[PDB]
Ligand binder design. Sequence first.
Ligand SMILES: [Mg+2]
Ligand SMILES: [Mg+2]
Ligand SMILES: [Mg+2]
Lengths: 94, 410, 121, 45, 50, 282, 125
Amino acid sequence: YKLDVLSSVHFVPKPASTSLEIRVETPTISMEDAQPLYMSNASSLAPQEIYNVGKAEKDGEIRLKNGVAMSKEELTREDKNRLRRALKRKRSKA
Amino acid sequence: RAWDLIRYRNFRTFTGTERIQFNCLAVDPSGEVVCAGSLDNFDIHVWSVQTGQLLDALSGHEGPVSCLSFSQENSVLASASWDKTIRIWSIFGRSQQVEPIEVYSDVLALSMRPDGKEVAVSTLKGQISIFNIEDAKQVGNIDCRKDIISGRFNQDRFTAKNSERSKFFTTIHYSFDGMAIVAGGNNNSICLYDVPNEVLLKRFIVSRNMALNGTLEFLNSKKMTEAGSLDLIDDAGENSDLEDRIDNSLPGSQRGGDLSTRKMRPEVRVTSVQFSPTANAFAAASTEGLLIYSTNDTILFDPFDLDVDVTPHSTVEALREKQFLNALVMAFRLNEEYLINKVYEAIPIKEIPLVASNIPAIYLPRILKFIGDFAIESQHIEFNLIWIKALLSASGGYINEHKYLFSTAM
Amino acid sequence: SLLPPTDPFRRKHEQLLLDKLYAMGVLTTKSKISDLENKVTVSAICRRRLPVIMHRLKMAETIQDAVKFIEQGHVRVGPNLINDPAYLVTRNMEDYVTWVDNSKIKKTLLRYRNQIDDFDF
Amino acid sequence: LREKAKERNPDEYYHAMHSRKTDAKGLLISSRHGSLSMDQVKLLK
Amino acid sequence: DDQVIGKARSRTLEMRLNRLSRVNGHQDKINKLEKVPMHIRRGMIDKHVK
Amino acid sequence: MLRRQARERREYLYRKAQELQDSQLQQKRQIIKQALAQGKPLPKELAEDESLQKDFRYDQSLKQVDDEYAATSGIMDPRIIVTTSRDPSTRLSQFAKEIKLLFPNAVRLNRGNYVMPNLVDACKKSGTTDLVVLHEHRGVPTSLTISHFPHGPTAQFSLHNVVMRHDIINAGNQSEVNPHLIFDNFTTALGKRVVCILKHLFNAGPKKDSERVITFANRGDFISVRQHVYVRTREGVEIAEVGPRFEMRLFELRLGTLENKDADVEWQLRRFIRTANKKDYL
Amino acid sequence: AVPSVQTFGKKKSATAVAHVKAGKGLIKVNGSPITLVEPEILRFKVYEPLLLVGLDKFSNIDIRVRVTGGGHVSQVYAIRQAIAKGLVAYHQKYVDEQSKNELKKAFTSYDRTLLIADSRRPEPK
RNA sequence: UGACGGAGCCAGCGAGUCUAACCUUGGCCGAGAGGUCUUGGUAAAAACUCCGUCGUAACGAGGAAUUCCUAGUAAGCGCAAGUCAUCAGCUUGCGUUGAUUACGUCCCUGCCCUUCACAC
RNA sequence: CAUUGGUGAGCAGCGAAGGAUUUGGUGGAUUACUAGCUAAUAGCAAUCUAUUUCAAAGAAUUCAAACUUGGGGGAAUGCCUUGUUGA
Ligand SMILES: [Mg+2]
Ligand SMILES: [Mg+2]
Ligand SMILES: [Mg+2]
């Protein structure tokens, strides 16, 4: 602080770093300052954040990000192979 | 840092690889590209909003980049530097092109026309030069060194007239119509110029506080003594409380610290100026605070196209005779807010479509301005919506042809 | 120094302090950590004041002369005139120390070499 | 000498610049010996 | 060595370096008593001896 | 810019001269570190040096690519301009294009009436990393100089046995992937210096299955430069020449841009010394 | 002292130094009248300032231009730039600033190169 | 879009007591070495502007194919230097005059990449 | 030939009981004008002070009080804290 003020804040920025923050769902009005007005009424967490369609809880079920769910019993064999191959490519990228 | 106002989250943050201080910023109209400049890099860093990746670094300036702006229509990027030059970057498109334009002195500020066809720059010489972007040739120049009012500081050993401390404008902005420029700097003046005719419409004194250092051009000779200015003597020791007596000032600090750190009086200066998108007003950030100047009161009598026959009495006679269009037009020719309001509310709902279709094109911008200002605080929500519906349907095409005449009203 | 020599925290902060002080110009070299004690002095900070840097850039014949020119409003750093002779100039900002455009000193510099152009002035 | 030329600071100011003069070509002119008033000339004549 | 911090580190390092230096360095140069006034040092020695 | 570049060079030059003075100090600290770890007695000079022992407490916590290239090594891809001498012949223009294709991020620029100070100043403004200038004798390339911006070094080579790809019929088009690099038989410090200069002309991080390889093979100070395309077979590798062939011999290396003829020479070829033939410097 | 101003015009290697002072309308280039400037085909080029602002303004000043370096065309452009800059500077220093603004407006409207140097610095691509 | 002659006139690089021919005819002096003189042959800024005169065996601006090229760029003109590699059957610099056409497209040909809000 | 170098000798032109340059002192402004003193609900302004004294009220265990120190290492004798001895 002292050196920055001495140099009239012409310093060289610090090296960048990454840190984690926790955001708690709350009404957007609370985050604002205290006055007889509010600007936004939404929630602090987006709908994706509250719920993301993920891996199927049941083993026999297959669930995708788009929300489509298929049980392994109903899938035809050609579809099982197609989904298995699609699984391989996704894993290979990651 | 990008901020999302609906949820108040810093949804993204951009940073250069070499950790450079950023002093200016520009955002694409599409909101998909962000460019920032620095006073120690000489390059313009560009980021992608969706990804956060540094798309590219624009090079070519031989001095620090002082300011940036995207064209709202053409989407070109205009940058100016202390390199005494201006460069127009066509970053979008298959081929990247740069068009440098030379200027007589260091460029301190830059404003982009809403049309996107011209750019104005304030130079260290106290000049506002307007250039044509497509043709890259100068189209106007406004001299401003004489207009600027700069005060002598208590610590200065040289006169204000000979002082070259701030005789230039560090910030400028167009009016949304495109016919006026409002300028400010590290000086006690805000000057409002008219672009097409290159004249000073008006000058505003930012402050009249003798506490601020730069207010006065001439200082009282009684303060001067054999020791020096009586003001420069520090009277902190006289204060009774210890906290007031403590001096935490660093020897050479000029900026970026608390007031206790500086040890010198605050200096009257305007950091930024802008026009109101929706009203005939402008706001200037200064030391004391954000001054807002507006034309709301409208006590002035500024008639348009009067004749002897036009009179406040005559307008009321037209209303009683049920000549609504003539009553409304004569009210506009007088340009009296109360008379416009009286005629506006006296037109029956059945007659609104007939009147709206028959209003002359010259008075169309005036009615739209009145409705917007009147509707925001009035209680007649439905009546105003009926009028707006009639006006847009009747003269929607005309407003489209002239977007910048009707921008603030719309 | 009293932290263990192999500590990652010790090495990080010591380099950061060396990085910052060199940028200000207080420290001439970044190589040796011992410089933070031996070569950190008031003279090192005073040597970065505007009058001294003018003297080293040969803008003035003496530090006293440089102070007078600053007090007389001939010196600007970037676009800002500075009449404070205690302004500390970082290494990056030493490039922008120069005379004011309408300074009588600039005219003498250009007039001496017969390179004065009155269009600029 | 070339390095001195390249590293020259355009803003270097010396008080002697007033007394010293430069030719049209750009070279320093040096007086061989370092004008006479009429009263001096009348006595010499 | 990695765990030790504080004055223990500073006093440990100095003791080690003095031990190594004693072999080849001249006795006068390697060890020098810090300058103290006589009336203080004689007082310090007397109290320590007690 | 010009003021900033000038000061940065002076600070860089000043830093070096201090480092040469500090080299003795660094070795002294190494002796102290060894003695503490091993327990052996210190030498007499170190034993009586009280200042160094005090300094050692702060300097105990102290720990490659060349200094010019260290800042951007593996971070920013190079930007290269390939140019020629004034009024180049048709063959030199063709060869300059081949060198342009050799480096992934090279751009060919016409040198008609460009001045050398103007050329380097223009390239420094645009962020160019290296500049390649080619010379010829009656349509035969003879020399190749590589100037690394903003402050050097400038390495000059003489080309022999040049076989351009234009001399090949039905050769086809080149592949422009980021190529793999082979630097064979570079041992001496000068050899490492040359390798660092040549390595940084290419993009960092080629794909593992990249099918293009560029090899610089040192054979008695004559670096053979070849470009090959390979296909991994079931029992080995099969390669094919893509060209061009040429052998480049370093004869000068200066610490500055090619414009500055006054730049201090890092290394030069002494041809008339009596023992010139015996030793190979690279 | 006689009020005088000095200006430079430059085009490639050609450099022209213009000295503008109070006088009686005496325009000379390299010690000869402006009417003798060569090549004749480009003579009106060097006349362009004199005609654009009118000869009446020059009736109260003397201009002396000395040109060195470059070829014929670049020398002509240096002369015209120097003349325009000298006139503007003289009207700035020893006449009202209103006339300065009018002169600058006229010169910039006709050809901005009269005032600002036309420098074709290389731009790599 | 000529030749001849005259006139006018415009550059930037470059400065080691270092810069530089050959073969003959003969006089004189000199012990010689050689010195001096005499003699014939061979070799070894331009563009630009103005004015005056004449006058419109091989080859008369180069086929098929193929290559290169985007602004102080292509092309024209001359002047210097020869910088430990290369170069004089030439090489590298320097200035002067200075354009036409594109600055769009993935249609063809190759190379390459992919499969933290709001809105989509 | 050019001096936009110095020093002089003179015209044209301007031109009402002279003109030009430099400098010391004081006065008025440089913030927006409701009068002087005191023991001040009134006296004085020529002061009284020969009524100017009494009465009433008025004293936090805050009985706390360096927010005030350039860095490293100590501090014999001092000083601070804590216990302890004998009155
Ligand atoms: Mg060419
Ligand atoms: Mg040539
Ligand atoms: Mg060549």
